[PDB]
C-alpha cells in the first residue's frame, strides 16, 4: 500500500505565521492523468474531519485562501499564509490514487500566544460522594498558556504520587488557552483522617508556586 | 446542505455483531460512491469499506483487516448507507464515519462510537462542584463512574455557554471513566442567577439535572 507520512507531528506558531506541512508518499502518486489525487483534510477537536485541499492544491468550497497546497511526485505540501486561533486542528494528507485509502498520521497545529496564569479553583468532595464511601478532590487551572503546568497534591503537607489524574482542554478556538481538571481521589476513611488538602500550581505565568487549599 | 446521519453503534461484546446505518440528504445519494472511515487513538484515521453504483453493479471495496467480517450496502431508494459488522474484535473499536466519496472523502457524518468491550454499561454519578467565596467564581459538575463513553455536559439547558469547559474523561483504575465540567461566573450573580448542568448519557439512557449551589 501506498504509506502516508506526515511531519512534523505537531508545530506551535503565532498568529500571522506561515506555516508549511509536508506530506510524503511511499511510491510516487501517479500524475500522468493530471494532478495528483492528494487531499488536505482539518479536524477540529470533538468534530469530524472536513475535506480542506483536493488534488493537491484545490481548495475545497468554502475554505479560506490562506490554506494553500502545492507538491509532486512523492512530496506535497500544505501551507497556511497567515495562522488563526480557528485554524488550529489537527491537519491529514490522504490519497485517493490506488486502494486500500491511506491516511497520513496528522500533524497537530497549535497556536503560540503570549503566556497567561491560571486561576485556580480547589473544590471539596460532595457529602453525596462521601455517603457513596469515596472522596473525590478536584483542582481547576483555567484560561493558561503555555500548557505545560506542574500540578502537586499535599495532603497534610504529604506528597501525593499516584491516586490522582489530570485532564486538559484543547486550546480555545478564541484565546487559544488551555484548562486543566485535576482529581484527587481517596477513600472516606482517608478523607476524614485528614485536615489539609492543597493542590500546588506551578507555571510560567506564575513568579512562584500558587497553593489552593482547605479543610476538613 | 449536506447531511449524513449516522445511528446503531454502542457497547457490544467481542465476537458481536452491530449493524451500522447512514441516513444522507442534500444531495442525490445515488449518484455518488459511498465509503466508511474509521478512527482511533492507536492507529489514526482508517479507510473501512466502499460501495459503487448500481451503474458499476454495486461494486464495493474493503480493508483487508476487515474483508468477510464487514458488509457495505446501499437502498438508493431509502437514500441509506448501511455496514453490518460482525465477528468485533477489539481492534475495531472507535469512531465510524460515513462519508461521500468523489475522488476524495469529501463530506462526513458526524460519527459513531463502536466499543468493543465485554463491560457492562452503568450509568454515572453527578455531583456538584460547589463554589466558596475574587471577581470571578467557579462550580461545577463531577460526571463520575459511566461506561461507556461518551456523555455530554450543558448548562441551564443549553442558555449558559459563556466560560464552560467540558473536560476530556480519564480512565480510572477501575473500567469505568469520570469527566468534569465546570464553567466561571460573576460571583455577583451567585444570588441572582440558578446554574444546573444537565447531564446526559445515552449509552444508559440516564438524564440528570444537578442544581450547583454554595
Ligand atoms: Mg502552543
Known amino acids: 500500500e501506498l504509506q502516508m507520512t506526515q511531519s512534523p507531528s505537531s508545530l506551535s506558531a503565532s498568529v500571522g505565521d506561515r506555516v508549511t506541512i509536508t506530506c510524503r508518499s511511499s511510491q510516487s502518486l501517479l500524475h500522468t492523468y493530471g494532478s495528483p489525487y492528494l487531499n488536505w483534510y482539518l479536524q477540529k477537536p470533538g468534530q469530524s474531519p472536513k475535506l480542506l485541499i483536493y488534488?493537491?492544491?484545490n481548495r475545497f468550497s468554502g475554505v479560506p485562501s490562506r490554506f494553500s497546497g502545492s507538491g509532486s511526485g512523492t512530496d506535497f505540501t500544505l501551507t497556511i499564509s497567515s495562522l488563526q486561533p480557528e485554524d488550529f486542528a489537527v491537519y491529514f494528507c490522504s490519497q485517493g490514487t490506488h486502494l486500500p485509502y491511506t491516511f497520513g498520521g496528522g500533524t497537530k497545529v497549535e497556536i503560540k500566544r503570549t503566556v497567561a496564569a491560571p486561576s485556580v479553583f480547589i473544590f471539596p468532595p460532595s457529602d453525596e460522594q462521601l455517603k457513596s464511601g469515596t472522596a473525590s478532590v478536584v483542582c481547576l487551572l483555567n484560561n493558561f498558556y503555555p500548557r505545560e503546568a506542574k500540578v502537586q497534591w499535599k495532603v497534610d503537607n504529604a506528597l501525593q504520587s499516584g491516586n490522582s489524574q489530570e485532564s486538559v482542554t484543547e486550546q480555545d478556538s478564541k484565546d487559544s488557552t488551555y484548562s486543566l481538571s485535576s482529581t484527587l481521589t481517596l477513600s472516606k476513611a482517608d478523607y476524614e483522617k485528614h485536615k489539609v488538602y492543597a493542590c500546588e500550581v506551578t507555571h510560567q505565568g506564575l513568579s512562584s508556586p500558587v497553593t489552593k487549599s482547605f479543610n476538613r | 446542505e449536506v447531511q449524513l446521519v449516522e445511528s446503531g453503534g454502542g457497547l457490544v461484546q467481542p465476537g458481536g455483531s452491530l449493524r451500522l446505518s447512514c441516513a444522507a440528504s442534500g444531495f442525490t445519494f445515488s449518484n455518488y460512491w459511498m465509503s466508511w472511515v474509521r478512527q482511533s487513538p492507536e492507529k489514526g484515521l482508517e479507510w473501512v469499506s466502499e460501495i459503487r453504483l448500481r451503474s458499476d453493479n454495486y461494486a464495493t471495496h474493503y480493508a483487508e483487516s476487515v474483508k468477510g467480517r464487514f458488509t457495505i450496502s446501499r437502498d438508493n431508494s431509502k437514500n441509506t448507507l448501511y455496514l453490518q459488522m460482525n465477528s468485533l474484535r477489539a481492534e475495531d473499536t472507535g469512531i465510524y464515519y460515513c462519508?461521500?466519496?468523489?475522488?476524495?472523502?469529501?463530506?462526513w457524518g458526524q460519527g459513531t462510537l463502536v466499543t468493543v468491550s465485554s463491560a457492562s454499561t452503568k450509568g454515572p454519578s453527578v455531583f456538584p462542584l460547589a463554589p466558596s467565596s475574587g471577581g470571578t467564581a467557579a462550580l461545577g459538575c463531577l460526571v463520575k463512574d459511566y461506561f461507556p463513553e461518551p456523555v455530554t455536559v450543558s448548562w441551564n439547558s443549553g442558555a449558559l455557554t459563556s466560560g464552560v469547559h467540558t473536560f476530556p474523561a480519564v480512565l480510572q483504575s477501575s473500567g469505568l471513566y469520570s469527566l468534569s465540567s465546570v464553567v466561571t461566573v460573576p460571583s455577583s450573580s451567585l444570588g441572582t442567577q440558578t446554574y444546573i448542568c444537565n447531564v446526559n448519557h445515552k449509552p444508559s439512557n440516564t438524564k440528570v439535572d444537578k442544581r450547583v449551589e454554595p
Open positions: 488534488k493537491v492544491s
Open positions: 462519508c461521500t466519496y468523489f475522488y476524495s472523502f469529501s463530506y
